[PDB]
From a paper:
The sliding β-clamp polymerase processivity factor adopts a doughnut-like ring shaped structure where the DNA passes through the positively charged inner hollow of the clamp. The β-clamp itself has to be loaded onto DNA with the help of the multi-protein clamp loader complex. β-Clamps are essential for many important DNA transactions including replication and repair. It recruits various factors like DNA polymerases, ligases, and other DNA interacting/processing proteins to the ‘scene of action’. Structures of β-clamps are known from diverse sources including E. coli, T. maritima and S. pyogenes till date. These structures show that the β-clamp exists as homodimers whose protomers assemble in a head-to-tail fashion.
The structure was solved using molecular replacement (MR) techniques employing the structure of the E. coli clamp as the model for the calculations. Structurally it is similar to those of the clamps from other sources like E. coli, S. pyogenes and T. maritima. The crystal structure reveals the details of the positively charged inner ring that is involved in DNA recognition and the hydrophobic binding site that is involved in the recognition of partner proteins. The structural conservation of the Mtbβ-Clamp as seen in the crystal structures is not surprising, especially for a protein performing an important role in various pathways involving DNA. The comparative studies demonstrate that the peptide and DNA recognition region(s) in the Mtbβ-Clamp is well conserved compared to other clamps and no obvious differences could be detected in these sites to ascribe the lack of interactions of the Mtbβ-Clamp with the LigA. We find that the mycobacterial clamp also has specific affinity for DNA and exhibits about 1.8 times higher affinity for primed DNA compared to nicked and dsDNA respectively. However the affinity of both homologs for blunt dsDNA is similar with Kd 453 and 557 nM for the E. coli and [name] clamps respectively. Mtbβ-clamp itself exhibits affinity for components of the clamp loader complex. Surprisingly we found that no direct interactions exist in vitro between MtbLigA and Mtbβ-clamp. The results therefore suggest that other as-yet-unidentified factors/mechanisms may mediate interactions between these proteins and DNA.
Residue numbers in the entry:
A (entry chain A): 8 to 402
B (entry chain B): 10 to 402
Write the structure that this text describes.
């Protein structure tokens, strides 16, 4: 259907990219068989590939000499496999009605065709709500996404919380053992904009790589009194764009959970501390736990087991407060430590049954008021925080 | 008096240890066998592993400040040895526990009873030797064609045949035959037996031949090359033994073509890419087909969607038009192994094995109207024989 049949000439380099970006979303085995197709559409002077699985929906637009408009549905994985395995010659697509003739050099393909009238019109895309640099959005989404619950038996934990307080945005995710919070400055579209939504975590992290080009990605939730309404979020920028259906769940109150002051405060090198963790945990005890003895200007981490496999390492910590001994799940620990994206790290303990607080450290800012070992230290502002619960094992 | 203790460079300790755990992997049957055995003596340390089939043993130069031996869990040692800094490592048996120390890293590993470890095999007398890099190349070329399936051994081994001065390697999964011909320096120029060694055990030992620049097979010598039911690869610091396989192996020289009705010659590079591409639509991967005509071949797979792909490339061909079908993996496996610039096919009919062999420089490549009627087999040191394929309706 359409009247004519689609035919075009794309550069392959460009065809292959556009196609993979669309299959990287909506993977899996879609529920209704049709949804496994992608949709190519020639018009104006550009081609648009489109995918849709009812939750997410991607769509790329590449510049291609179309020598005849139309649209066709063709199996999506097959197109992606072929597009990546082809030479680097220009590729000649041409619908011979019911079959797609694909040609690139002396390679010739005859793919079957899916009924382009069972494809259910991918969503529209709410009105722009603001924008921010693409590389910064990526960094910010990775930092927060680690702490998101990967388990499907329970959503809510599976989302990133996006809160907009016009001009600043804050990202937060949590699996119940970690909290990652990122604070951000974007260019809003209505400087009095003010809502908060919950978007599925992977859908969002995936779209943080369609932000390499664009050098400026744009969130589209809605504008004004209808930012919530319109049950979805839209990431656009460069040639790519996507929508993900928002998550209808309430998310931990969460500012309540942060420390106001810390009884102890440490500061060692991230590099060294990671290596030291990956090493003592080899004997870990099914990987369960690593422990940190904090004293004077040194910390001794140590795991050990049912063989009593015992390992320990000592490194120098710029410490302040009374000797403290705390235990962490070693993965949660290194996850947080990778994310700080910094040279060195700063721990903030209340007691040893209460969340440690990791945040980054670049240059000797503070210290400053870190001499008075005998009593509470200030929280101190920061744009990235990782809150890590301490761990317990049974006998 | 005191228990083993020593000082190794880590770089050297880590290598020696991994080489011993790369063999005898899995979950050994008797629990003890999961340990490795460190032994200090003379002025060298030797790690030893053993699983009843294979048995490796590396020897590294280490300042031992006290001789002895201890058994410690093998995977744990390998994990630790690879995760340690680059400082010198201080092992020291505090009897019942091994104290391992490398910088400010300190480990206290448990100890296994070194008297349940069952004395690893002795190693038959040297039978010959050949360059290590050539032995590796030759083992990879022949090993692809070996059957990976355990329901049936025999297909699982490489056939090593020695005809003093020349050795030949052969493996087969029943659909491919790879044969490699080799010149080594024997120990008794009238040496003459043939044995079957498990295929992986041998390919694994083809990487403990990077150093040594000269690896040495030890089956026995004279009238007792067969007897002594095992093979021994040594060289550099490493050495291993593998228990030989007691099976008869396809008669196999019978299966080669004397003459070919057709003979083709195209570029290996182009042909591989072309195969990997048309097989995307392959039909569960089952088959690729080659139409041979004049000076061009058109490969093409297609399916139940009829997913149809095809590509045309230029073949230096000689004989009457032929159309043959191969399993595409078997095909590219063979094609990788030729280790050559270009390839030469040798077809009898189209229900009979093609013959792949390498081509470097215009020695004989069609060479015109030889011609049409039968072509010569032509000697070669590496041959890949690939059965054509059939699918059911």
């Amino acid at each position: 259907v359409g009247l004519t049949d689609l035919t075009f000439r794309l550069l392959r380099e460009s065809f292959a990219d556009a196609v993979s970006w669309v299959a990287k979303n909506l993977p899996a085995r879609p529920a209704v068989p049709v949804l496994s197709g992608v949709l190519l559409t020639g018009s104006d002077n550009g081609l648009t590939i489109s995918g849709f699985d009812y939750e997410v929906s991607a769509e790329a637009q590449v510049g291609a000499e179309i020598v005849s408009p139309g649209s066709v549905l063709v199996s999506g994985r097959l197109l992606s496999d072929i597009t990546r395995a082809l030479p680097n010659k220009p590729v000649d697509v041409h619908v011979e009605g019911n079959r797609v003739a694909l040609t690139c050099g002396n390679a010739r393909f005859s793919l079957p065709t899916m009924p382009v009238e069972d494809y259910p019109t991918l969503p529209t895309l709410p009105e722009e709500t603001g924008l921010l640099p693409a590389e910064l959005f990526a960094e910010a989404i990775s930092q927060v996404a680690i702490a998101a619950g990967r388990d499907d038996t329970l959503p809510m934990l599976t989302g990133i919380r996006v809160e907009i307080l016009g001009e600043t945005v804050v990202l937060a995710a949590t699996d119940r053992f970690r909290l990652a919070v990122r604070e951000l400055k974007w260019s809003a579209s209505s400087p009095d904009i003010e809502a908060a939504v919950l978007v599925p975590a992977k859908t969002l992290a995936e779209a943080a790589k369609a932000g390499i080009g664009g050098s400026d990605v744009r969130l589209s939730l809605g504008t004004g009194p209808g930012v919530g309404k319109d049950g979805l979020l839209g990431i656009s920028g460069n040639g790519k764009r996507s929508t993900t259906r928002l998550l209808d769940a309430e998310f931990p109150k969460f500012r309540q959970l942060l420390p106001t002051e810390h009884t102890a405060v440490a500061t060692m090198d991230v590099a060294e501390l990671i290596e030291a963790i990956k090493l003592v945990a080899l004997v870990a005890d099914r990987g369960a736990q690593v422990r940190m003895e904090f004293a004077d200007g040194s910390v001794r981490l140590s795991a050990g087991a049912d063989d009593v496999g015992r390992a320990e390492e000592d490194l120098v910590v710029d410490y302040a407060g009374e000797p403290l001994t705390i235990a962490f799940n070693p993965t949660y620990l290194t996850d947080g430590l990778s994310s700080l994206r910094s040279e060195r790290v700063s721990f903030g303990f209340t007691t040893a049954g209460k969340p440690a607080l990791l945040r980054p450290v670049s240059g000797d800012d503070r210290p400053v008021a870190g001499l008075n070992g005998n009593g509470p230290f200030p929280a101190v502002s920061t744009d990235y925080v990782y809150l890590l619960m301490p761990v317990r094992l049974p006998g």
